[PDB]
Amino acid sequence: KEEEFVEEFNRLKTFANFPSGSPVSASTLARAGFLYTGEGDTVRCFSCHAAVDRWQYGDSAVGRHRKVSPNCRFINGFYL
Amino acid sequence: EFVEEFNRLKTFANFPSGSPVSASTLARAGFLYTGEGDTVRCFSCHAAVDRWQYGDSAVGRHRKVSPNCRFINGFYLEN
Amino acid sequence: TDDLPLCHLSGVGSASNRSYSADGKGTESHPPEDSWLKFRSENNCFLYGVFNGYDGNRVTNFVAQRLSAELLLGQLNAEHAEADVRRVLLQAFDVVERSFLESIDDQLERLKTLEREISGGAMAVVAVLLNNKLYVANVGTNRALLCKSTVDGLQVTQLNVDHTTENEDELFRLSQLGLDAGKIKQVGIICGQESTRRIGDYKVKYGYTDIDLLSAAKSKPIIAEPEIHGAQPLDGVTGFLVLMSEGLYKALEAAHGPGQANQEIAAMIDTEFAKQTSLDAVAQAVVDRVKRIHSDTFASGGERARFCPRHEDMTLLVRNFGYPLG
Amino acid sequence: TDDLPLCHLSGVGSASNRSYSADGKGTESHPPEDSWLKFRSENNCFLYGVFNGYDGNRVTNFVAQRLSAELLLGQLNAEHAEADVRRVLLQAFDVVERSFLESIDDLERLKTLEREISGGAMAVVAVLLNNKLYVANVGTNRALLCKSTVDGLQVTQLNVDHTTENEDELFRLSQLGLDAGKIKQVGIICGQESTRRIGDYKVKYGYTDIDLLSAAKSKPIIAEPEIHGAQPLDGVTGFLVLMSEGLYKALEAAHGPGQANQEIAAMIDTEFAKQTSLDAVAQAVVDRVKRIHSDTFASGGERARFCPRHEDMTLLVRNFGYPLG
Ligand SMILES: [Zn+2]
């Protein structure tokens, strides 16, 4: 259900069909704990299941992440 | 304080004109205006939402962003 | 009284409802309950509106005038702030409501009338102009579109939201009131109406408690408070404003198909714009065109034929914004 | 073999580093360590690059060629998927790394040791395949795309600076077990400010022996590149810019932080209508920037104390239907 995405490598794999023309780097999104859902450019924290979309050039993965879900543990270091 | 819907609405007085979603609707959705751009935050989950576009659903976008902002799930009905 | 300066940069087209007869081209009709507004305050303030009424036109012909009194007689005419303009409308729509309710206070042919006025109502869309800033107040399912001319096409964006049971927000509002989402969204209809907000309708506004679907509710499920839309910058813009009744976009949709209706309507208004002398002509032309498309579809029936037994009143209001008429 | 067809729709400008003398007519220099790539595979595939080296050019002149081998000899030439082209680069940058490390495996001796053990380089690589643009990045070199708008010239940087000022890079180092605040505070790690780089045997294998990186379950300074999803170039009309740190670094020192990308782009625009060849366009801007630098130092005032000298400057331009004249 939701166990395979704790591992960073897997999260990355979910980006193979990510919409070309997107600003933020896939690898960076994954590092940030994000996972690609499948619709548009929407992604979700494997921790807080919060989703993030509508990226723009110059965005920070962890940045927008902290803003949207100011507590997605991963973002707060409860995962080491 | 922002638990009260009327207050949340008050924080929209200086909301940037040209925005798609109606203020009143945003508040009903539990959002409050931060002050920067068109960024708003659930008074419950403190989750923020910005970059609105025409045709957006306050509650909709909200449930997508924070699929658990209690408010959105009904754990709020003071009665 | 209700006779101030009319706008001259706005046209209107309309066609009463009509029903089709199996025999074909055969048509009928019923009392028409739709009205519009195109005034201009002496202080250079513009007020446009389109009210689609239901169950009697005793309401549409009221809110129309009464709204004007609470808006073009000062209250709005001034150098007000954005939030101020919103506050005034809010107070305006309320005065019309409370007033109207007080209005409805008057053989056995009596029970005949009662059930009428107690169930009479209307929905409305109001557009206001003040220094190239546009405001849209909305109650119901009427649409308002802004059409900017792009150097890459014609931009079309709907300024308001349809207050139906398919509205994620409207549903949630009714949920917080204590009703069931799924069930309400399922029936998709509440008291013959699909609209979740409307003016008048004494019955459901005071006796909602006696209706199985609305039984559980700390407050009125069907409210009349309008949804205002923050001022729109119209300085460098170049296009036109469209206010159309449900009956119109509803017909077009029944023939061609759901969605893609706003653009198509806009697309039509574009063409006819270069083929007319007056806006009214532009307007009427499109209403006729749509009225045609409907009848033809039913006649030359096939698949979508089973969706055009008839059509409700159709009203279209157009307010030019520097778009080439000639 | 390092001689395949070179691209003809791409120009390059460059100026070695130089140090001034408090005596006006001063101008010194040092061994130049910067390289570029502008090849074109026989199968119609484009590969451009800019490698800014540090402490020896024994690395820049390596990665340059070696990267070509693992890219222009088939591996990429084909009808591959987006994610596929990404996977090939990843594999590519890795081969160069692992290979290079094995290279560096062969008293004036300690003199050389400390050198190659600390030699390294950073790189920006751009690839073209069916009007789809790909940018692989490792370091602080910038790559900008400039589309011509009917309301101005749009400038957008395709990559991100791998410095300690990067919220993401910092976070990455944090999850490794180091302290953010402390790292961001010094702003420097082993003479370098870059958080990712090729080579540098020292920090890659002995980071554990450096007070700042002591605590780390993995390499704090990695060489993995940051790939940027294909970019649609069909209806586009402008140009691609790949420039080394030394360049945007100098222009920044004189005029001031920020607004550098636009200004450089603005310059490339003008010179574009005043030249016969791209190389000319390119060089022109490098010279112009080189000028603004010296002038600022000479006609010193306030920003004068920020131009004691300047490192190598490299600029690569790839036209996309822009009016050369
Ligand atoms: Zn999260």
Ligand SMILES: [Zn+2]
């Ligand atoms: Zn919430």
